[PDB]
Design goal:
This is part of a larger assembly, with chains A (49 residues) and B (51 residues). Chain A is an alpha+beta fold and 49 residues long. Chain A contains one helix and two strands. Chain A has a two-stranded antiparallel sheet. In chain A, a hairpin with a 4-residue loop joins strand 1 and strand 2 (23-27). Chain B has no helix or strand. The termini of chain B are far apart. The chains are: A alpha+beta (49), B little secondary structure (51). At the A-B interface, loops of A face loops of B. Chain A: This is DNA-directed RNA polymerases I and III subunit RPAC1. Chain A: It is found in: Nucleus; Nucleus, Nucleolus; Cytoplasm, Cytosol. Chain A: Belongs to the archaeal Rpo3/eukaryotic RPB3 RNA polymerase subunit family. Chain A: It comes from Homo sapiens. Chain B: Residues 29-41 have a biased composition (Pro residues).
């Protein structure tokens, strides 16, 4: 879901990182986003952002 | 050479060429369908927002 979140945005805003080995997502420089609003087409992840 | 009238004929032979059908009756050979439009590979976000 972190990789899907990273791909539903512009390249750069979501830093998906391996803290434990598992991946978590965080917002990193949200200035890069162009409001394509592609996360609102993902049905599962349109409730988490 | 008196040329008398002869009798009525029995029947009729009729000679005509027959077509060859070893070719046709085969499975049909249609024109192949053009492919549906597929997305090109290597499409990337070229535009990054200003600032």
């Amino acid at each position: 879901a972190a990789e899907e979140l990273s791909r539903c945005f512009s390249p750069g805003v979501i830093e998906v990182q391996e803290v434990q080995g598992k991946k978590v997502a965080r917002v990193a420089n949200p200035r890069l986003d162009t409001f394509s609003r592609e996360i609102f087409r993902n049905e599962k992840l349109k409730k988490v952002v | 050479g008196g040329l008398t009238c002869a009798s009525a004929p029995q029947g009729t032979l009729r000679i005509l060429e027959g077509p060859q059908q070893s070719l046709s009756g085969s499975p049909l050979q249609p024109i192949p369908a053009s492919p549906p439009p597929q997305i090109p590979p290597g499409l990337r976000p070229r535009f990054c927002a200003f600032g």
